[PDB]
Protein backbone atom coordinates (compact mmCIF):
# COMPACT_ATOMS: atom_id res chain seq x y z
CA UNK A 1 0.00 0.00 0.00
CA UNK A 2 1.36 3.40 -1.08
CA UNK A 3 2.04 6.21 1.38
CA UNK A 4 1.97 9.78 0.15
CA UNK A 5 5.23 11.59 0.74
CA UNK A 6 3.47 14.93 1.46
CA UNK A 7 0.63 13.96 3.85
CA UNK A 8 1.50 10.29 4.70
CA UNK A 9 -2.03 9.23 3.78
CA UNK A 10 -2.26 5.62 2.54
CA UNK A 11 -4.10 5.02 -0.72
CA UNK A 12 -4.87 1.73 -2.44
CA UNK A 13 -4.28 0.97 -6.12
CA UNK A 14 -8.02 1.72 -6.69
CA UNK A 15 -7.32 5.45 -6.29
CA UNK A 16 -4.36 6.84 -8.19
CA UNK A 17 -1.68 9.21 -6.95
CA UNK A 18 -2.91 11.96 -9.28
CA UNK A 19 -6.37 11.58 -7.80
CA UNK A 20 -4.85 11.99 -4.34
CA UNK A 21 -3.13 15.23 -5.40
CA UNK A 22 -6.32 16.72 -6.87
CA UNK A 23 -8.64 15.76 -4.01
CA UNK A 24 -6.32 16.33 -1.03
CA UNK A 25 -3.72 18.90 -2.20
CA UNK A 26 -5.74 21.32 -4.40
CA UNK A 27 -8.84 23.42 -3.52
CA UNK A 28 -11.74 21.07 -2.73
Amino acid at each position, epitope marked *: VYK*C*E*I*C*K*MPFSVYSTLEKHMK*K*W*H*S*D*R
Partner: nanobody, 113 residues
Framework: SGGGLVQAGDSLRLSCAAS????????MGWYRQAPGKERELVAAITSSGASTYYADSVRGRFTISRDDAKNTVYLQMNSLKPEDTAVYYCAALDEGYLDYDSWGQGTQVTVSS
Protein backbone atom coordinates in the same frame (compact mmCIF):
# COMPACT_ATOMS: atom_id res chain seq x y z
CA SER B 1 -9.14 20.88 32.87
CA GLY B 2 -5.68 19.70 33.86
CA GLY B 3 -3.65 17.61 31.41
CA GLY B 4 -3.71 14.88 28.75
CA LEU B 5 -3.51 12.01 31.28
CA VAL B 6 -6.75 9.99 31.04
CA GLN B 7 -7.86 6.36 31.15
CA ALA B 8 -9.19 4.05 28.43
CA GLY B 9 -12.81 4.54 27.45
CA ASP B 10 -12.55 8.22 28.31
CA SER B 11 -13.03 10.77 25.59
CA LEU B 12 -11.15 14.00 24.84
CA ARG B 13 -11.44 16.79 22.33
CA LEU B 14 -8.51 18.56 20.71
CA SER B 15 -8.55 21.88 18.90
CA CYS B 16 -5.95 23.54 16.70
CA ALA B 17 -6.28 27.24 15.95
CA ALA B 18 -4.19 29.93 14.30
CA SER B 19 -4.45 33.66 13.70
CA UNK B 20 -5.87 34.94 10.44
CA UNK B 21 -7.56 32.55 8.01
CA UNK B 22 -4.54 30.38 7.08
CA UNK B 23 -6.30 26.97 7.08
CA UNK B 24 -8.74 28.10 4.37
CA UNK B 25 -8.30 26.47 1.01
CA UNK B 26 -6.11 23.76 2.57
CA UNK B 27 -7.01 20.30 3.68
CA MET B 28 -5.99 19.80 7.30
CA GLY B 29 -4.74 16.82 9.22
CA TRP B 30 -4.15 15.60 12.75
CA TYR B 31 -0.78 13.90 13.22
CA ARG B 32 0.66 11.97 16.12
CA GLN B 33 4.14 11.03 17.29
CA ALA B 34 3.72 7.92 19.41
CA PRO B 35 6.72 6.51 21.30
CA GLY B 36 8.76 4.49 18.81
CA LYS B 37 7.02 5.37 15.53
CA GLU B 38 7.34 8.19 13.02
CA ARG B 39 4.43 10.54 12.19
CA GLU B 40 1.02 9.00 11.68
CA LEU B 41 -1.80 10.75 9.86
CA VAL B 42 -4.64 10.06 12.26
CA ALA B 43 -7.40 12.03 10.53
CA ALA B 44 -7.78 14.47 7.68
CA ILE B 45 -10.44 16.69 6.15
CA THR B 46 -10.55 18.18 2.67
CA SER B 47 -10.64 21.95 2.10
CA SER B 48 -14.42 22.01 1.66
CA GLY B 49 -15.03 19.67 4.59
CA ALA B 50 -16.93 17.35 2.27
CA SER B 51 -14.54 14.40 2.63
CA THR B 52 -12.75 12.70 5.48
CA TYR B 53 -9.87 10.27 6.18
CA TYR B 54 -9.21 8.17 9.28
CA ALA B 55 -6.41 5.81 10.16
CA ASP B 56 -7.69 2.25 10.62
CA SER B 57 -6.87 2.15 14.34
CA VAL B 58 -9.08 5.17 15.18
CA ARG B 59 -11.84 4.81 12.60
CA GLY B 60 -15.21 4.76 14.30
CA ARG B 61 -13.79 6.47 17.41
CA PHE B 62 -12.23 9.76 16.23
CA THR B 63 -14.00 12.61 14.43
CA ILE B 64 -12.45 15.52 12.54
CA SER B 65 -14.10 18.84 11.73
CA ARG B 66 -13.18 22.35 10.69
CA ASP B 67 -14.45 25.91 11.18
CA ASP B 68 -12.73 28.19 8.68
CA ALA B 69 -14.58 31.17 10.19
CA LYS B 70 -12.73 30.62 13.48
CA ASN B 71 -9.62 29.23 11.68
CA THR B 72 -9.89 26.18 13.89
CA VAL B 73 -9.78 22.43 13.37
CA TYR B 74 -11.10 19.84 15.81
CA LEU B 75 -10.57 16.17 16.65
CA GLN B 76 -13.15 14.49 18.88
CA MET B 77 -11.55 11.43 20.44
CA ASN B 78 -13.91 8.83 21.91
CA SER B 79 -13.00 5.52 23.57
CA LEU B 80 -9.31 6.18 23.99
CA LYS B 81 -7.00 3.14 24.05
CA PRO B 82 -3.44 3.03 25.44
CA GLU B 83 -2.19 2.77 21.83
CA ASP B 84 -3.53 6.35 21.31
CA THR B 85 -0.70 7.69 23.51
CA ALA B 86 1.28 10.30 21.59
CA VAL B 87 2.00 13.94 20.94
CA TYR B 88 -0.71 15.37 18.71
CA TYR B 89 -0.28 18.05 16.03
CA CYS B 90 -2.40 19.56 13.28
CA ALA B 91 -1.03 20.73 9.95
CA ALA B 92 -1.81 21.54 6.37
CA LEU B 93 -1.75 18.34 4.34
CA ASP B 94 0.60 20.27 1.98
CA GLU B 95 2.99 20.37 4.95
CA GLY B 96 2.59 16.92 6.56
CA TYR B 97 6.24 16.06 5.89
CA LEU B 98 7.90 19.17 7.35
CA ASP B 99 10.05 19.04 10.46
CA TYR B 100 8.13 19.04 13.73
CA ASP B 101 10.09 22.25 14.47
CA SER B 102 8.17 24.23 11.83
CA TRP B 103 4.87 22.86 13.13
CA GLY B 104 3.04 24.13 16.19
CA GLN B 105 3.74 22.93 19.69
CA GLY B 106 1.71 19.82 20.16
CA THR B 107 -0.19 18.33 23.07
CA GLN B 108 0.37 15.04 24.83
CA VAL B 109 -2.48 12.59 25.21
CA THR B 110 -1.60 9.82 27.67
CA VAL B 111 -4.08 6.92 28.09
CA SER B 112 -3.76 4.34 30.91
CA SER B 113 -6.16 1.39 31.49
Amino acid sequence: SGGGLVQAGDSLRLSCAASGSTFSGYAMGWYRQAPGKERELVAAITSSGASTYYADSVRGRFTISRDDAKNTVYLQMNSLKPEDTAVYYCAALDEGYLDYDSWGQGTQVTVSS
